[PDB]
A paper describes a structure:
Bacterial caseinolytic protease P subunit ([name]) is important and vital for cell survival and infectivity. The caseinolytic protease P ([name]) subunit is a compartmentalized structure with two stacked heptameric rings that form a central chamber containing 14 identical catalytic sites sequestered by two protective axial pores. In any case, even the degradation of small oligopeptides depends on some structural factors, and the most important one is the orientation and positioning of the catalytic triads formed by Ser98, His123, and Asp17224. The protein’s mode of action corresponds to that of a chymotrypsin-like protease, and it is described in two main steps: acylation and deacylation.
Aiming to explore and explain this paradoxical effect, we solved and refined the crystal structure of native [name] from [name] (Se), an opportunistic pathogen involved in nosocomial infections, as well as [name] in complex with ixazomib at 1.90 Å and 2.33 Å resolution, respectively. The superimposition of both tetradecameric structures displays that the complex is slightly more extended than the apo SeClpP, and the Cα RMSD is 1.63 Å for 1451 atoms. Ixazomib, for example, is a compound that does not affect the integrity of the barrel-like structure, as also observed in ClpPs bound to peptides or other peptidomimetic compounds. Despite the similarity between the overall structures and the high homology between amino acid sequences of ClpPs from different species, a closer look into the monomers exhibits a difference in the Gly-rich region. The structure in this region seems to be more ordered when ixazomib is present. As already stated, the boron atom of ixazomib is covalently bound to Ser98, while the peptide-like portion of the ligand is stabilized by forming hydrogen bonds with amino acids in the active site of [name], which cause to some extent cooperative structural arrangements. A comparative analysis with the native SeClpP, the SeClpP-ixazomib complex, and SaClpP Y63A29 structures revealed that the Asn42 side chain in the complex, as well as in the mutant, is shifted to the “down” position (the hydroxyl group is approx. 5 Å distant from Tyr21). It indicates that the boronate compound can control the conformation of the axial pores, even if not bound to the hydrophobic pockets. Based on the previous discussion, here we show an allosteric activation caused by the inhibitor ixazomib. This ligand, at high concentrations, controls allosterically the N-terminal loops in the pores, in a way that globular proteins can be degraded inside the inner chamber of [name].
Numbering used by the authors:
A (entry chain C), B (entry chain I), C (entry chain H), E (entry chain M), F (entry chain J), G (entry chain D), ...: 4 to 7, 18 to 192
D (entry chain N): 4 to 8, 17 to 192
J (entry chain B): 4 to 6, 18 to 192
């Protein structure tokens, strides 16, 4: 809200992006646009992505994820408060070695959620889709954390809360940022 | 509504059951109860089940279906107006040779419909359930009509409307009742 | 509402059925049940069906129509107030020579109405269904009135209101009942 | 609501050939009134029927189901307005056997033109307009016959809501007598 | 609610009518019907009308009022609890000398209330109607109470609450019924 | 709905109880009352409990369950349509050897569901309660089916649908009732 | 949301258009206006259209589609997150050789959806319209992908989800943009 | 939405007006104001009116139509996406020879729609009004297309969809703008 | 909506006021303020008031009307689209000789509309008010048009639609502005 | 509301106003203001005024961990009410620089939440919120000097404290007199 530029525009000048909400299509379109703009300004300097998010749309999250992996600058990820669901997926997506959480930040991982209505045939199509989406997410999370796909699958069957230290041990982040 | 007994109680005295609504658990509980009662009164005399129904719950319909096949009396089925979805399934369930439709009655067959909300795992469970339910329905309908399961599957992919004459050719009924 | 039996049960004792509402599945189930009961009581005496109805479901109306043509007794139809849409179709369905309207009663004929929502394929299925239903209705109305199918089609494209005298000239009734 | 020795109060009065029209006139009300008229005639085709009318009006076609049944059956139907006969209620009041149409002294009668609605294409609005205008002509012609007023006077006097005292209703020809105590 | 007949049917056997609600068309229909029935049973014995009512429709109240004045039996009126607006008008309408209130019963008189919506011309018609209705009510109340029309007009401009004793002094009742 | 007694009262005369709805406190109150009454009429003759139910309240179901085990008569259970959740628990509760399902009836088992809201302390109390309730249900189901508690726990983690034949192999019923 | 110009206005300076929402008339009016403006600024430099969209109105999508094909500059299309329904149609509409998806982006194709209410005649008109619209879409998609119209028809009967790699095989895009 | 001026203000600098929504009084006020302003800036240079509109108010559309015919500059009309109802009327209103549609744009023509409530007299007034409005529209459309008034009347009785090529053959536009 | 100033502010620079909506208190306050401002800028140059309005509040309209008659500059009125009810009253209020309508613009005149709810006395007060307001409007309209008050009264009893040419012959405008 | 807006003008003097419930948007703004103030000057004190009924635990921890992360001392000043997570953040200011005005109110209590679904899911939610309560109690114990046992007992129900009681408790260091 405050003016200095608004406060977030002022931090964007220093290559800081604030992801502080649910991840929907509008949020992703803004974050992607900020990433593309920061890269056009300087393709060498690190970007800093702060993440306080309960999660959101899988496809919106993948728009952000693929943009992070596409652009030349390293994107550091810093979890403050909560990175849950697609929020923890994006936290794990930062440049390897530059993924952080503050000491009391919380990380939560779980499987995708959705809904389906209609004919048996359509419910089948929706089920196959969301199951294939879960496999895609598990494969990527396996690669970013070093855990096996089997372990990822087991650990996301239900809501799984992790402390910052547990998130580091898991491979979701690299360091807990001490004061 | 009118009194003679109410009009439907008066027809139940003559072993006539009127199924004239959507099939839910309360409707099934009444129809099943009327079938059990008619059998306890006389285990040999035919029962007459008039069907004007847009369909309804698969399990409620199977409560009626299995009761028809369980009891000793033959249950004749007479379609007036419309037998759609589970209504056409119950029409096909009458005693072989005693399944009828009036000349302008309409029959409609299609696949089950449902919904599923939650985790990928739960959507998978719901999808497998409704697909297995569709196979159960197709196998039984194949047995009652003489059509192959593959033909039943094709012919129910979308809403399939049949005239009374087409319903007889299909094997859903035995005779069109002429005036 | 009043008691004598309720007033309609008292008239049913004299083989009078009152159709005084929209035609839905519950109304059709009651009327069909009253017709079957009157026939079981006496298969030769006339039945009298008074019709004051704005219309309703096509399949519910056909449950009544096919029952009229099925049973042995003649069913006289008497229009009081309004027979519109499926109400005028059932008025035309009485025993030939025994279809009446009171002098200020109104008759209205028009084409079926419906709705369709979903994929192009499903909208196509619904369109073919309602068009085939319109052809079925026109063919029957042509046979009951003596008008050609082409004329019926033309005269039902929009709401077409007829006086009792016009309804007699049209062939929808046989006589205007004078005082 | 109350019960008499077993009858509800209206069923008890129907035994004496009294029908109570005490509500809006819709299809269910007309169905009941028509059924009571047919039943009273089947019981005795010669004795008068008494139709009390306290009604704000209602559906034109429902009212005509009642009107044509009154004119069809052999018994005379007396009409007695208590409280209000408005719109189709005043039309049915005027429909009683000539000489046997009454209102109590403080009863109110109101006459006006039909009301409706139309929605859709220009063509459909045209069809609905022609229908309701033809219905108004039908109502005016009948009311002209029942009251002795000209159709042009009926048309003028129903352009807007027109309230009449019982005495004015008698002078108009809508009733024959104000029933004094 | 209780059965002894329901409780009100049992009191109707003793020529007691209970007016214990808002006066609308259904209430008036019932009260008028009870009055006509009591007169047909015995045209010479008094009727007792208990009144606990907040008022209601003017025309519904006049259906009751004119029926009271029409029938041969005297109708005593007994106010218990409250007779307000059209309720106090009907209380004043009992047989002169036989209008009562219990000692703590409340009587309220005021002018008619209504609404009008539409063209200036229609609002004018509605205004003239309700003003003429107020004059009719004042003239009758003047003759039942002995007060002048001017005084009635002045005393009903706003809600005017009266004790039972004040109602007797006003002429609305004849006696306060002591224990 | 129909009268012969209503249809269910007529079957209660033959010691048949119809459980055809969701199990809440009113349903349990009625079923318990019917069981107590049937026992008071004859403490030696079998009772027949038909079950078509999606489930319901655990405590309402236990009111029925404990009443079944308390009374002297054997209670046969017959699944028609659907016995799900507490419905399948009550199906398994019939007299051993007298638990049935019709061939197309469906059985579903799963773990309890609930909600909790308030302070951490209150959420803890609610969690311990529902977990202890699940252990109680598993222990009883283990006794009634012969499966181990561990297997019951694994098989109820998610919605688990069983055919009638699968329900018999599981130990939930004793026989599939063939036609 | 952020200011640098808003972030999207800043990217429009570099000939980047962000389509990140459902496609309705307002979205199309903006995109068309941005295309016309970019062409007026420079008729030879490429335009970049990022697409993250669940789809939307067919006619709104065709306003965008025909504008792309009208203007002189090549329009590259880049799918991030999701291009579904009309979104995947516009993705396929980019300059041939310049249609991209990021590796985890999702593409979905299916047939048009709509609704129709009214007379049989009007439902027929609406059905013919949406079927002709589907043929128009299939013909164009056939041209843009190289698949036959029959294959397009078969592959869009139900929701058909494609990975980026599958979308390239299909001909909807030319390249998956690797990091 | 985007900034350069907003995108539409930037195109207005080049004498381009974007009509991309329903036509109501606010839309007409804006379009009329833009037309008057463009004429005041230069009374000779062409104006370009892009039309993507489902239609709207007849009087709002005539405010735009009469302003087009009043001002000195030619107004070219370009249909993108859909010009339906009053949208197709305004498309036909462009300077003769300068009325265009893009190849996949859709044109729809039909008769006016409205509603009327109240007294018979008021419904008559509303009916005469909308019928006279339809004649006014048909006369003008006849003049702009070269079709007879009777053909216009027949072709607008129901929703009539036209391709761009059909719209040119009809006389609603002069050219389909090829790429 | 568009910027050049917004489009309406740009036209206000040329002494053009756009009345393109319902007339309520906020609209009147703005129009009055624009009139006062234009007069303060130049007390001799004409003002141009475009009117496309369905009408609105009588007192809001009189705030505008009295301001027009108060200020020194002539106010030309130009009807585009529709001037109905208070909109046609303000159209008639322009400087005599400078009141215009475009050829297809519609003018409608009728009597005031309102509502009243409460005691008879209050309904009387409201009726007298709206009738006196109608007389005030008729007297002014009589002066502005040259028609007698009795003709104005007859011609406004119901909705009265006029073409531009009819409005000129009536005296509501002076000229139809041809192209 | 008034005009910089009034809060932007105070941010120029390193004053942050936390005057609402603490949700994710509020935390994102406060965190952003803290990061910005530190980037402007990593030495000068920041002043955080707190009038808040509380809010989300994780949103509050985003603010809390940012306070402890940055180099500048963050003074906390309670005006009106610091309740629940608001009182937790008040206790989080630089030791010696935690204040309340004399009539300000402080309230402490345990976390609140909800859980719907299977027994297994209710168990997961219960363990989560209980572990969150332990985390909050441990931190509050360190910031106040009270034992974890005492914190647990004093937060079982809503516990209202005057400013003076809050100082005695260790939630603040000083009551700011006029
Ligand atoms: B989460 O942030 O809650 C989660 C993300 C993954 C990492 C666990 N989000 C969802 O599950 C949201 N669901 C969807 O985007 C979705 C996906 C699919 Cl494939 C189908 C429907 C829905 Cl709604
Ligand atoms: B129909 O009558 O419309 C149809 C029955 C078969 C014969 C096509 N009804 C349904 O499919 C109703 N659906 C279910 O009973 C159902 C609902 C849900 Cl949420 C999940 C599974 C099932 Cl099987
Ligand atoms: B009418 O009573 O208004 C009319 C009947 C015919 C005689 C004109 N009723 C309907 O058209 C109601 N429509 C349907 O019952 C129907 C039929 C079909 Cl085939 C498809 C959809 C619907 Cl909704
Ligand atoms: B009144 O009883 O209120 C009146 C009857 C006549 C005597 C004035 N009722 C109506 O005008 C309404 N009744 C209709 O039957 C009607 C409704 C509609 Cl929407 C259209 C036409 C008709 Cl004719
Ligand atoms: B009272 O019961 O509250 C009162 C009657 C008094 C004056 C005796 N009732 C009403 O005023 C109720 N109003 C009407 O019945 C009415 C009358 C008229 Cl004339 C017009 C409209 C209405 Cl709504
Ligand atoms: B089922 O009938 O759907 C199921 C019981 C099965 C698992 C035997 N029902 C429920 O879980 C319904 N839940 C409760 O009655 C309940 C139980 C407890 Cl212990 C706490 C809360 C609730 Cl809401
Ligand atoms: B999609 O984006 O979901 C889809 C477009 C095609 C490419 C599959 N959208 C629609 O089908 C939306 N439907 C329409 O625009 C439409 C609606 C109606 Cl009622 C009638 C016709 C059409 Cl063409
Ligand atoms: B359309 O754009 O959907 C259509 C335009 C004509 C050219 C086919 N619009 C309408 O018909 C909207 N109707 C009106 O503006 C209108 C006109 C009249 Cl004269 C009376 C009522 C209404 Cl609502
Ligand atoms: B019209 O704009 O629809 C019309 C104005 C006259 C010229 C016909 N509007 C109204 O009548 C709106 N009504 C009022 O402003 C009004 C006036 C009075 Cl006196 C009392 C109540 C109301 Cl609501
Ligand atoms: B308070 O601000 O009201 C309180 C904070 C603590 C210090 C007492 N807030 C809450 O308890 C709000 N609850 C949550 O943030 C929460 C936490 C957990 Cl672990 C689970 C669910 C919820 Cl909703």
């Amino acid at each position: 809200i405050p003016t200095v530029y608004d406060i977030y525009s002022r931090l964007l000048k220093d290559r800081i992006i604030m992801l502080g909400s649910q991840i929907d299509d509008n949020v992703a379109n803004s974050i992607v646009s900020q990433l593309l703009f920061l890269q056009a300004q300087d393709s060498e300097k690190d970007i800093y992505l702060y993440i306080n998010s309960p999660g959101g749309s899988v496809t919106a999250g993948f728009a952000i994820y693929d943009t992070i992996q596409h652009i030349k600058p390293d994107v550091q990820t810093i979890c403050i408060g909560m990175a849950a669901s697609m929020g923890s997926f994006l936290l794990a997506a930062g440049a390897k070695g530059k993924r952080f959480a503050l000491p009391n930040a919380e990380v939560m991982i779980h499987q995708p959620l959705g809904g389906a209505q209609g004919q048996a045939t359509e419910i089948e199509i929706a089920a196959n889709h969301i199951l294939k989406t879960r496999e895609k997410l598990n494969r990527i999370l396996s690669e970013r954390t070093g855990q096996s796909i089997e372990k990822i699958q087991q650990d996301t069957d239900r809501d799984n809360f992790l402390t910052a230290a547990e998130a580091k041990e898991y491979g979701l982040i690299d360091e807990v940022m001490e004061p």
